[PDB]
Amino acid sequence: VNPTVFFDIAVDGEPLGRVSFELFADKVPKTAENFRALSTGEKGFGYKGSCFHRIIPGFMCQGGDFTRHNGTGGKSIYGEKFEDENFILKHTGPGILTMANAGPNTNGSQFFICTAKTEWLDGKHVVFGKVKEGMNIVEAMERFGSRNGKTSKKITIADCGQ
Numbered sequence: 001v002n003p004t005v006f007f008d009i010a011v012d013g014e015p016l017g018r019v020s021f022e023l024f025a026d027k028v029p030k031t032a033e034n035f036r037a038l039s040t041g042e043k044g045f046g047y048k049g050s051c052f053h054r055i056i057p058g059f060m061c062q063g064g065d066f067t068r069h070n071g072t073g074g075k076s077i078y079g080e081k082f083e084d085e086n087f088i089l090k091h092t093g094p095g096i097l098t099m100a101n102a103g104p105n106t107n108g109s110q111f112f113i114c115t116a117k118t119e120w121l122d123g124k125h126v127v128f129g130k131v132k133e134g135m136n137i138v139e140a141m142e143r144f145g146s147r148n149g150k151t152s153k154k155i156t157i158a159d160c161g162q
């Protein structure tokens with residue numbers, strides 16, 4: 001019933017493998033739809049070609065800034081940053097997909113793939129999906145991260161879709 005999307009991940013342009021995600025459209029439909037549509041490219045823009053610009057071991061891989069590629073950009077499919085949809089789902093472990101934001105009600109297009117149980121985000125970040133296949137690839141990505149998230153290689157979404 002929930003939709004599934006994928007990213008093909010590359011490291012300095014060399015394929016690392018495919019990560020797939022379940023999006024929890026049954027609980028956070030607006031937030032799921034935003035990520036789903038950015039993954040397909042159906043609105044004419046989205047995640048294909050973007051990078052994970054901040055990777056912090058023990059915490060997350062952060063991506064989704066497909067406009068400035070550095071955390072300062074990103075945009076939703078709604079024409080404006082959108083509200084926190086709900087906090088029904090919690091940060092229960094590695095593989096959780098949750099929105100990155102600039103505080104309450106500032107969701108754009110950036111997200112974390114959690115690499116640990118990140119319970120310190122509960123009630124502040126909207127959980128909207130989880131890794132289905134390819135968690136080992138996310139663990140491999142995490143190894144290219146460092147203290148404040150600087151990545152040692154360019155980690156990109158070479159392709160993506162539903």
